[PDB]
Structure formats: structure tokens, C-alpha cells
Design an enzyme around this catalytic site. Sequence first.
Site, PDB file in Angstrom:
ATOM      1  N   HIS A  62      -3.048  -6.011   9.895  1.00  0.00           N
ATOM      2  CA  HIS A  62      -2.008  -6.806   9.208  1.00  0.00           C
ATOM      3  C   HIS A  62      -0.626  -6.310   9.657  1.00  0.00           C
ATOM      4  O   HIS A  62       0.272  -7.121   9.804  1.00  0.00           O
ATOM      5  CB  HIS A  62      -2.192  -6.765   7.682  1.00  0.00           C
ATOM      6  CG  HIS A  62      -3.562  -7.086   7.254  1.00  0.00           C
ATOM      7  ND1 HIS A  62      -4.146  -8.358   7.428  1.00  0.00           N
ATOM      8  CD2 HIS A  62      -4.476  -6.313   6.645  1.00  0.00           C
ATOM      9  CE1 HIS A  62      -5.366  -8.348   6.942  1.00  0.00           C
ATOM     10  NE2 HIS A  62      -5.602  -7.096   6.480  1.00  0.00           N
ATOM     11  N   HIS A  92       5.690   0.512   6.185  1.00  0.00           N
ATOM     12  CA  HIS A  92       5.297  -0.469   7.187  1.00  0.00           C
ATOM     13  C   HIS A  92       6.402  -1.488   7.309  1.00  0.00           C
ATOM     14  O   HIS A  92       7.367  -1.438   6.532  1.00  0.00           O
ATOM     15  CB  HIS A  92       3.991  -1.147   6.797  1.00  0.00           C
ATOM     16  CG  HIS A  92       4.103  -1.845   5.515  1.00  0.00           C
ATOM     17  ND1 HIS A  92       3.850  -1.257   4.317  1.00  0.00           N
ATOM     18  CD2 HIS A  92       4.530  -3.113   5.281  1.00  0.00           C
ATOM     19  CE1 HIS A  92       4.115  -2.161   3.351  1.00  0.00           C
ATOM     20  NE2 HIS A  92       4.552  -3.328   3.912  1.00  0.00           N
ATOM     21  N   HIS A  94       7.281  -5.858   8.259  1.00  0.00           N
ATOM     22  CA  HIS A  94       6.925  -7.261   8.489  1.00  0.00           C
ATOM     23  C   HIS A  94       7.939  -7.820   9.488  1.00  0.00           C
ATOM     24  O   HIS A  94       9.131  -7.465   9.405  1.00  0.00           O
ATOM     25  CB  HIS A  94       6.979  -8.111   7.203  1.00  0.00           C
ATOM     26  CG  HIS A  94       6.201  -7.506   6.075  1.00  0.00           C
ATOM     27  ND1 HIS A  94       4.913  -7.910   5.821  1.00  0.00           N
ATOM     28  CD2 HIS A  94       6.455  -6.488   5.236  1.00  0.00           C
ATOM     29  CE1 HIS A  94       4.458  -7.208   4.775  1.00  0.00           C
ATOM     30  NE2 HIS A  94       5.350  -6.296   4.418  1.00  0.00           N
ATOM     31  N   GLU A 104      10.568 -10.795   4.578  1.00  0.00           N
ATOM     32  CA  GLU A 104       9.883 -11.367   3.394  1.00  0.00           C
ATOM     33  C   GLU A 104      10.917 -11.815   2.375  1.00  0.00           C
ATOM     34  O   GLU A 104      10.973 -13.007   2.059  1.00  0.00           O
ATOM     35  CB  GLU A 104       8.885 -10.332   2.858  1.00  0.00           C
ATOM     36  CG  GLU A 104       7.795 -10.055   3.876  1.00  0.00           C
ATOM     37  CD  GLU A 104       6.500  -9.619   3.280  1.00  0.00           C
ATOM     38  OE1 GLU A 104       6.532  -8.650   2.521  1.00  0.00           O
ATOM     39  OE2 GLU A 104       5.460 -10.255   3.614  1.00  0.00           O
ATOM     40  N   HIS A 117       9.299  -1.726   4.442  1.00  0.00           N
ATOM     41  CA  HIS A 117       8.867  -1.411   3.086  1.00  0.00           C
ATOM     42  C   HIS A 117       8.408   0.035   3.030  1.00  0.00           C
ATOM     43  O   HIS A 117       7.401   0.389   3.692  1.00  0.00           O
ATOM     44  CB  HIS A 117       7.714  -2.335   2.687  1.00  0.00           C
ATOM     45  CG  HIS A 117       8.158  -3.740   2.527  1.00  0.00           C
ATOM     46  ND1 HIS A 117       7.291  -4.833   2.537  1.00  0.00           N
ATOM     47  CD2 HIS A 117       9.403  -4.220   2.306  1.00  0.00           C
ATOM     48  CE1 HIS A 117       8.015  -5.932   2.304  1.00  0.00           C
ATOM     49  NE2 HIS A 117       9.302  -5.585   2.184  1.00  0.00           N
ATOM     50  N   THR A 196       3.085  -7.957  -1.574  1.00  0.00           N
ATOM     51  CA  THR A 196       3.279  -9.207  -0.804  1.00  0.00           C
ATOM     52  C   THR A 196       2.070  -9.514   0.082  1.00  0.00           C
ATOM     53  O   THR A 196       2.092 -10.514   0.790  1.00  0.00           O
ATOM     54  CB  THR A 196       4.524  -9.168   0.073  1.00  0.00           C
ATOM     55  OG1 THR A 196       4.311  -8.173   1.081  1.00  0.00           O
ATOM     56  CG2 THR A 196       5.771  -8.873  -0.727  1.00  0.00           C
TER      57      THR A 196
HETATM   58  O1  LIG Z   1       1.533  -2.422   1.572  1.00  0.00           O
HETATM   59  C1  LIG Z   1       1.181  -3.584   1.381  1.00  0.00           C
HETATM   60  C2  LIG Z   1       2.000  -4.770   1.876  1.00  0.00           C
HETATM   61  C3  LIG Z   1       3.163  -4.937   0.941  1.00  0.00           C
HETATM   62  N1  LIG Z   1       3.100  -5.089  -0.393  1.00  0.00           N
HETATM   63  N2  LIG Z   1       4.353  -5.173  -0.821  1.00  0.00           N
HETATM   64  N3  LIG Z   1       5.177  -5.083   0.181  1.00  0.00           N
HETATM   65  N4  LIG Z   1       4.410  -4.939   1.289  1.00  0.00           N
HETATM   66  N5  LIG Z   1       0.086  -3.918   0.674  1.00  0.00           N
HETATM   67  C4  LIG Z   1      -0.902  -3.094   0.112  1.00  0.00           C
HETATM   68  C5  LIG Z   1      -0.763  -1.719  -0.028  1.00  0.00           C
HETATM   69  C6  LIG Z   1      -1.802  -0.973  -0.569  1.00  0.00           C
HETATM   70  C7  LIG Z   1      -2.967  -1.584  -0.964  1.00  0.00           C
HETATM   71  C8  LIG Z   1      -3.104  -2.939  -0.832  1.00  0.00           C
HETATM   72  C9  LIG Z   1      -2.089  -3.705  -0.295  1.00  0.00           C
HETATM   73 ZN   LIG Z   2       5.313  -4.888   2.972  1.00  0.00          ZN
END
Ligand SMILES: O=C(Cc1nnn[nH]1)Nc1ccccc1
Ligand SMILES: [Zn+2]
Length: 258
Positions: A62, A92, A94, A104, A117, A196
Site C-alpha cells: 500500500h 509513511h 501517500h 489525502e 503521516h 485513511t
Molecule cells: O497507517 C495507516 C494508513 C493511514 N491511516 N491514517 N493515515 N494513514 N493505516 C494503518 C495503520 C495500522 C494498522 C492498520 C492501518
Molecule cells: Zn497515512
Amino acid sequence: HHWGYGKHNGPEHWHKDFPIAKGERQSPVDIDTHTAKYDPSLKPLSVSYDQATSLRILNNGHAFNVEFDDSQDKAVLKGGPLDGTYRLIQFHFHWGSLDGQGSEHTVDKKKYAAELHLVHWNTKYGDFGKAVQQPDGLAVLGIFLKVGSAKPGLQKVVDVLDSIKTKGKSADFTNFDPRGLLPESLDYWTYPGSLTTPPLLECVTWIVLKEPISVSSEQVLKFRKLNFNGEGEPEELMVDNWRPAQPLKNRQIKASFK
Ligand SMILES: O=C(Cc1nnn[nH]1)Nc1ccccc1
Ligand SMILES: [Zn+2]
């Protein structure tokens, strides 16, 4: 038929496996700068990354996550809208296929080239898995990227991406200092929202910095050489891994600055 960012599995499909995708506190959102209210009761944000211990970088199919040692209170976010102590677990990005999209959150409907993020969990819940089940479990610090001058502190990240091209690849990524990814100003907007990506849990206090960082075209081009696919599978470039703005509903975005 797992979730992603393609025509057949992208954000407009997520509600089928994750009905919270249509919930009351979903992220990201558009930040209408003329509607956000200055809140003089917010505090300065406390970003304490001096003792941060990065460990590893992972392509998860992802995005890529830079993972930290969150087994003690090394790298923490406090203050601003937050009560208590939030430990950095990973960061990470986007990003887009071209510089006119990728973020985002949006600012008066403007899309940035990318969004960083830095994900942190509330230590009063003991572990990340317990924290995501709580409305104040996570704090995500969001930073916009625009394309211009190079960000020197980003180059160590850029230069390891060739080694994690495909889904499931990881590399050692010790001694990375995330302070090198911050802008000068910590002025921010805040609102209650969600992850997100699936599982889209409504557990995040969002803190979105007003000041973007500048990265070079060469830096973001290297992000766009990553793959969503695994090794040996048909190449699908890792681009446009962003969820669009969701309805604000019954939420107020507050500004830390006048
Ligand atoms: O890190 C993200 C993406 C994100 N969310 N909010 N901003 N970016 N997702 C996520 C993290 C841990 C476990 C499951 C999903
Ligand atoms: Zn994110």
C-alpha cells in the site's frame, strides 16, 4: 480481491468490507481555511524525537512504513490538542502519479504532491492494537509535500527504496532521524477522524501542519518507482495511494494559529 487503490478495489469499494467507510468521523477531509476557527486554548505541540529509534523500512503493498522501536517512550508527541503521551510507531507517505495530486487532506480543495503521516499511539492503552479501539487512541501528524527544492532529511529514505521495490520486502533502517522531515513551523489544524486505510477505525486525533515541506522532483520520482505488486508479478507502479476527502459531518476543524 483485497482492498487497494485500483478501479476494482479502490476507496469507492472499501465500504463493502469496512462499512465504517461511510461513518461519522472519516478521514481525510478538506480543510476550509475560512471556516476553521482559531482556538486560543490549544497548546503548542511537543514533538520529542531526540531519542527516536528507527528499525526497518517495509513495502506493505500500500505504501512503505518506516518502523520505530515503540517498546518504551523514546519518540513521543504531546501537547497541542492531546491529553497524555503518544508513542511514534511508524511513518509513511501517500503520493500521486503527477505533482497535482497525492495528498489525502486538502486545503481549500488544493491537493499537494504527497502527504507524510507520523502515526503515534496513546500509551494509556498499553499497545497499538488496544489503542485503535478507542476514540482517542491515535494521533497522526500530517505534513504536506510540495515539489521544489530537495529535502535533505528525506534522501536516506529515497536511497533505500530500490531495495524494497515490491510488496513484502523490507530493509534494515536504523539511525534515521525523523526531525529532518519537519517544516520550520508547527502551526496546525486539528479535528477528530479516522485511519485513511482499512480498517478505517475512528480512533485518530488529526494534527495537520499548515507549512508544507519541499521535496525535489527527483525524490518523488523515486517514490513512484515502487510497486504495489509482489516480486515477479505484473508491475503495478505504487502511485495514487491516497483516499479522497470524506464528508466533514458534525465536526469542527480548529486552528492553532490566528
Ligand atoms: O497507517 C495507516 C494508513 C493511514 N491511516 N491514517 N493515515 N494513514 N493505516 C494503518 C495503520 C495500522 C494498522 C492498520 C492501518
Ligand atoms: Zn497515512
